[PDB]
Design a protein around this motif. Structure first.
Motif: not given
Ligand SMILES: COC[C@]1(C(=O)N2CCC[C@H](C(N)=O)C2)CCCCO1
Ligand SMILES: [Zn+2]
Length: 140
Positions: A2, A58, A60, A63, A103, A106
């Motif tokens: 991200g 967020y 990941s 979700r 992750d 995020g």
């Protein structure tokens, strides 16, 4: 994975930077796990300029976006991983939340905009690299 896309900048975890990021480098800091590269297209994210300690990030690997309370940016000891030896990471904020390998990247955001990106995990904790002090992201 991200990134933050603000202006003509792309903000990513330094340990996940691509060859194209290094070939279009604006700034990088290993102690913060951050790297910024230049982009051709303008981005839509806006950076928060505040001292919020509550926001949403967020995850990941779920979700899902989770609301969290997080510490102020500080110098925190992070265990050895495949990307860095055990060391002190600066400008890091911790919260209780799920974060597992994959992750990073995020976004954490508050009412004012983007606060930072996921940089650490494990043990029911999530750590975020703060970007609110990088005032230059708002210009040029
Ligand atoms: C989402 O974080 C991934 C990871 C982590 O904390 N790392 C690994 C990636 C580099 C991180 C850092 N900023 O030093 C440390 C994987 C190793 C243990 C569980 O979390
Ligand atoms: Zn805020």
């Amino acid at each position: 994975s991200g990134a933050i896309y603000v202006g003509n900048y792309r903000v990513v975890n330094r340990h996940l930077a691509t060859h194209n990021d290094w070939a279009n480098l604006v700034w990088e800091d290993s102690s913060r796990d951050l790297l910024v590269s230049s982009t051709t297209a303008q981005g839509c994210d806006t950076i928060a300029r505040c001292d919020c300690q509550t926001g949403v990030y967020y995850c990941s690997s779920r979700r899902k976006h989770y609301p969290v309370s997080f510490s102020k940016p500080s110098l925190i000891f992070v265990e050895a991983s495949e990307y860095y030896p055990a060391r002190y990471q600066s400008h890091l904020m911790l919260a209780v939340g799920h974060s597992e390998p994959g992750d990073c990247g995020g976004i954490l955001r508050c009412q004012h905009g983007v606060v930072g990106i996921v940089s650490t995990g494990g043990n029911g904790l999530v750590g975020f690299a703060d970007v609110r002090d990088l005032l230059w992201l708002d210009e040029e």
